[PDB]
Amino acid sequence: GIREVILCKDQDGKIGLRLKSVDNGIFVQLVQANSPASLVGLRFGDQVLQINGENCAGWSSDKAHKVLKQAFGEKITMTIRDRPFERTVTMHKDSSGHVGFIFKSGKITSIVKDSSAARNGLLTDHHICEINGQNVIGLKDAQIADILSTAGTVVTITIMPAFIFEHII
Amino acid sequence: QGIREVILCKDQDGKIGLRLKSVDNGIFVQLVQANSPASLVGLRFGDQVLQINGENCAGWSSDKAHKVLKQAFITMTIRDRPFERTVTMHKDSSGHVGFIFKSGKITSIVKDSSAARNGLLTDHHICEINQNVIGLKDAQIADILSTTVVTITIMPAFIFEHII
């Protein structure tokens, strides 16, 4: 469940990352688009186990950022555990195009009876993180709706429990 | 993980061995009785039940799922432990793994350990070792641990406390 990424600092010395301490681990809080971080596949909610061979366990957000800022040379290695708090739910649009849930400020708030969401056991009080391959974090409900409505028929959403989501952010 | 269908037969007394709970408009397994039909077909604490006999459980109360099973003239479609994840560690020279717990909850990670190397988190409840471990005294969990490669299944405390 674990992999290494090698980040190459951009010409300004940056990697496009913000990290956050949660339950004595370190997690990706923000990934800048088109950054060294986005290029190597880092996502919101990824767990950083090691930076340059050193364990992040127990580090504060401030410390993880200081370690990155002072990291020498042009390359930074990180060992990563892929989105541990998230899960994947796959649904299909009814002949009507809906799938079957309501959401508010990025959070799933209702499941529609007898929908694909209900059949697939979609849960409320969970934030939608990505839709069919794309971060929806920080976007407006209206933009989220539009991405959902830009149909695919098959809709795969990745979700995190709201409690956790709210601590990472 | 995806989904799976289990086929269950009530026992000789017409029992299943399950207690269920409504959480986030889903239905979860809150208790599996030792050596029940539920246990035998592989149901575990924290499993999600998506359907019973082909009816969606979405939005059902605990009370409603129970009566449906009592009334059940049983197939269940289930998601495996979706609030949970697994971490694998390797014992120390001294036989340790590298964490401290209290009442089933991991409270600290030992620096420079396998638990640290594998990103084991605090304020998580230990659900299984492999064993199940829910309900056991700490000195008992400690025995299973002591008795090289330790895999544990953990669940964030917030969700664990709500499910029980």
Author numbering:
A (entry chain A): 113 to 281
B (entry chain B): 112 to 184, 188 to 244, 246 to 262, 265 to 281
Paste lines from the article.
The diverse biological functions of syntenin-1 arise from its ability to bind the cytoplasmic domains of numerous physiologically relevant signaling and adhesion molecules, including syndecans, neurexins, and ephrin B12131415.
The crystal structures of syntenin-1 with and without a syndecan-4 cytoplasmic domain peptide (corresponding to the C2 region; 4C2) were determined to be 2.8 and 1.9 Å, respectively. In our structural superpositioning of syntenin-1/4C2 with syntenin-1, the overall RMSD was 1.493 Å. In the absence of syndecan-4 however, the molecular surface of PDZ2 in the syntenin-1/4C2 complex was wider than that of syntenin-1. Upon syndecan-4 binding, a structural rearrangement of the PDZ2 domain provided a specific binding pocket for the syndecan-4 cytoplasmic domain. Indeed, both pull-down assays and gel filtration chromatography showed that syntenin-1 exists as a dimer under physiological conditions. Our structural analysis showed that four residues (Q162 and A169 in PDZ1; R193 and F197 in the linker region) were involved in dimeric interactions with four PDZ2 residues (R199, N232, A230, and R231). Notably, both electrostatic and hydrophobic interactions contribute to the dimerization of syntenin-1.
